[PDB]
Design an enzyme around this catalytic site. Structure first.
Site, PDB file in Angstrom:
ATOM      1  N   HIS A 118      19.712  13.198  26.237  1.00  0.00           N
ATOM      2  CA  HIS A 118      20.549  13.027  25.076  1.00  0.00           C
ATOM      3  C   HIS A 118      20.467  11.651  24.015  1.00  0.00           C
ATOM      4  O   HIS A 118      21.203  11.799  22.939  1.00  0.00           O
ATOM      5  CB  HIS A 118      22.078  13.119  25.218  1.00  0.00           C
ATOM      6  CG  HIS A 118      22.662  11.949  25.645  1.00  0.00           C
ATOM      7  ND1 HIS A 118      22.881  11.749  27.123  1.00  0.00           N
ATOM      8  CD2 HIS A 118      23.220  10.916  24.986  1.00  0.00           C
ATOM      9  CE1 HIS A 118      23.657  10.645  27.193  1.00  0.00           C
ATOM     10  NE2 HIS A 118      23.759  10.246  26.018  1.00  0.00           N
ATOM     11  N   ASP A 167      20.317  16.049  31.971  1.00  0.00           N
ATOM     12  CA  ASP A 167      20.128  15.065  31.068  1.00  0.00           C
ATOM     13  C   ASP A 167      18.932  13.954  31.421  1.00  0.00           C
ATOM     14  O   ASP A 167      19.288  12.871  31.746  1.00  0.00           O
ATOM     15  CB  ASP A 167      21.469  14.516  31.027  1.00  0.00           C
ATOM     16  CG  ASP A 167      21.532  13.457  29.804  1.00  0.00           C
ATOM     17  OD1 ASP A 167      20.721  13.592  28.637  1.00  0.00           O
ATOM     18  OD2 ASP A 167      22.684  12.708  29.556  1.00  0.00           O
ATOM     19  N   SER A 225      24.206   4.446  28.006  1.00  0.00           N
ATOM     20  CA  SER A 225      23.242   5.711  28.096  1.00  0.00           C
ATOM     21  C   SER A 225      21.927   5.521  28.494  1.00  0.00           C
ATOM     22  O   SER A 225      21.260   4.728  27.727  1.00  0.00           O
ATOM     23  CB  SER A 225      23.449   6.895  27.078  1.00  0.00           C
ATOM     24  OG  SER A 225      24.548   7.191  26.744  1.00  0.00           O
TER      25      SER A 225
END
Lengths: 251, 15, 29
Positions: A43, A99, A197
């Site tokens: 992502h 992910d 992230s």
């Protein structure tokens, strides 16, 4: 990272910075898995709801970093990508299921005091460490509060039992994910946040004294919220995909 | 809520 | 490598410990 502290120097030598060429901004964290392979959250590259669809030419990889913002003159290595791989079944539509993505560096990186790879778990290392209560460590240059640090931040968080994970959200949790954080009763806080992230969730094995990457910083609801938890891609469950790509394309 | 931007587009030093 | 993976040059390699790694090891029960 919320409620973390400054990383020591060389504390997390596998820590990578995903950096956009122009504008110049921090996309995400990532991790060095060998001399030409970086692991991150799919992502950070592909997220159609936000119109994100990065290609090789869009990015740089910054290794050896400490300072978020400075060009760390004889320390960091900057590289260009040869190829990007996203899990074929990554679920950007409902829950960030899988992910995970691999990035192949244009030319291998030379290891130094500040640049060193992390190990990937084996079935046995996963089995004995990914247990509720066991703590892992997360690192990144992301928001400090649900604001941007000067140096790399670190926090130690305990793995949470599946059920509690499930009961904290309305999102569908799959086996390719785990959650970590303290309980509200626990009276210790910390979490990853926006900008962390794709960074590493790591544990140190007590058997062989090696660092293993168990998780990848994926998502949450807010940061450091009482009765909420951060979600991480379960690296061991996606290992066959990982092997698969490295074996068909590299090393 | 996805990790999805360190922000800045500012305080960065020239690469 | 990844033959020397998870062994930090400024810590494991010199037998030095980082400031909070013991909190980890201690949780492994």
């Amino acid at each position: 990272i919320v409620e973390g502290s400054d990383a020591e120097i060389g504390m997390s030598p596998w820590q990578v910075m995903l950096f956009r060429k122009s504008p110049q901004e921090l996309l995400c964290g990532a991790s060095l898995i060998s001399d030409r392979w970086v692991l991150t959250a799919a992502h950070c590259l592909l997220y159609p709801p936000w119109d994100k669809n990065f290609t090789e030419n869009d990015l740089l990889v910054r290794i050896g970093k400490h300072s978020r913002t400075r060009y760390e003159r004889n320390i960091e290595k900057i590289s260009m990508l040869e190829k990007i791989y996203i899990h074929p079944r990554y679920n950007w539509r409902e829950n960030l299921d899988r992910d995970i993505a691999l990035m192949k560096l244009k030319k291998p990186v030379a290891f130094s005091d500040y640049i060193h790879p992390v190990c990937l778990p084996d079935r046995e290392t996963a089995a004995s460490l990914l247990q509720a209560g066991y703590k892992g460590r997360v690192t990144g240059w992301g928001n400090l509060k649900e604001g941007q640090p000067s140096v790399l931040q670190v926090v130690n968080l305990p793995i949470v039992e599946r059920p509690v994970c499930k009961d904290s959200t309305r999102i569908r949790i799959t086996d390719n994910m785990f959650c970590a954080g303290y309980k509200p009763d626990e009276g210790k806080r910390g979490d990853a946040c926006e900008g962390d992230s794709g960074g590493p969730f790591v544990m140190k094995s007590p058997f062989n004294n090696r660092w293993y990457q168990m998780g990848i910083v994926s998502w949450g609801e807010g940061c450091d919220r009482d009765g909420k938890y951060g979600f991480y891609t379960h690296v061991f469950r996606l290992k066959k995909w990982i092997q698969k790509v490295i074996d068909q394309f590299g090393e | 809520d996805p990790x999805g931007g360190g922000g800045g587009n500012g305080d960065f030093e020239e690469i | 490598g990844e033959a020397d993976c998870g062994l930090r040059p400024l810590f494991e390699k010199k037998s030095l410990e980082d400031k909070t790694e013991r909190e980890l090891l201690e949780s492994y029960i």
